[PDB]
């Protein structure tokens, strides 16, 4: 469960991301694909080379979904409903992969937001991504 403090921390850090969100999403994916190669099995139809348009395109979609979750932080299960259905019924993403992406997103944010990535913010962000992962995984069975 996110606390009032967690919510504040996440809105603030994500606020600073702003219109870099799509770029950071794409970096998070590249970081994931390189550090954890098994995650590439879900994207056999993508060109995964550095700077790929499919990567950039997907990174934006992931980033927009996170932005929408932050915008609806008090109603995430409903705000992410459509996405939760999609992942459960059309994709077969093993839950551990969400942990891998979440980690890579933290690394990316740390790499770009030195002043905002404090210990308490790092903690709130990890809780936030864990909550998002839970929602997206909630209709699996």
């Amino acid at each position: 469960m996110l606390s009032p403090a967690d919510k504040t921390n996440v809105k603030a850090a994500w606020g600073k991301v702003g219109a870099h969100a799509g770029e950071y999403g794409a970096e998070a994916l590249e970081r994931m694909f390189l550090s954890f190669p098994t995650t590439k099995t879900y994207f056999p139809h993508f060109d995964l080379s550095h700077g790929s348009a499919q990567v950039k395109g997907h990174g934006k979609k992931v980033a927009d979904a996170l932005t929408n979750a932050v915008a609806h932080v008090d109603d995430m299960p409903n705000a992410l409903s459509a996405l939760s259905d999609l992942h459960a019924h059309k994709l077969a993403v093993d839950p551990v992969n969400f942990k891998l992406l979440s980690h890579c997103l933290l690394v990316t944010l740390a790499a770009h937001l030195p002043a905002e990535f404090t210990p308490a913010v790092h903690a709130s962000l990890d809780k936030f991504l864990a909550s998002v992962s839970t929602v997206l995984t909630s209709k699996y069975r």
């Binding site: 190669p37 098994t38 099995t41 879900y42 059309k90 993403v93 093993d94 699996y140 069975r141």
Partner: protein, 146 residues
Amino acid sequence: VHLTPEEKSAVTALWGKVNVDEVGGEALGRLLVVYPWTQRFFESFGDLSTPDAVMGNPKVKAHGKKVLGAFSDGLAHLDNLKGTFATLSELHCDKLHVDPENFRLLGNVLVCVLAHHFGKEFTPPVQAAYQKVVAGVANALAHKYH
């Protein structure tokens, strides 16, 4: 893998009583029922909408037999799982695109099926040995991923 001689013989002895046909069909079927999303890998198998349909699906049964046959051949190569499963690793990664985490799930389902079938005979020490085997097979099948 690091298997003790009493462990090696415990595995081998039990396996000699295994009906690979039945166990293979049961293991793969249970995987598909317990973790429904793995059905995405088997779209061409047909009706998988209910557990009964899954368990009765001839394609599920035939493929379970094939999987466990490979597994079975691996038990005769415990000292070299990596070399035994190399081509199978490449295939799972390059043609099939299967997340290796699924190999771990099938492995544990397999352990549950063995327990279901052998009851009392599937003691805690026998289980421990099989957990090492199942993790070694998983790791071997994941080895050539890139």
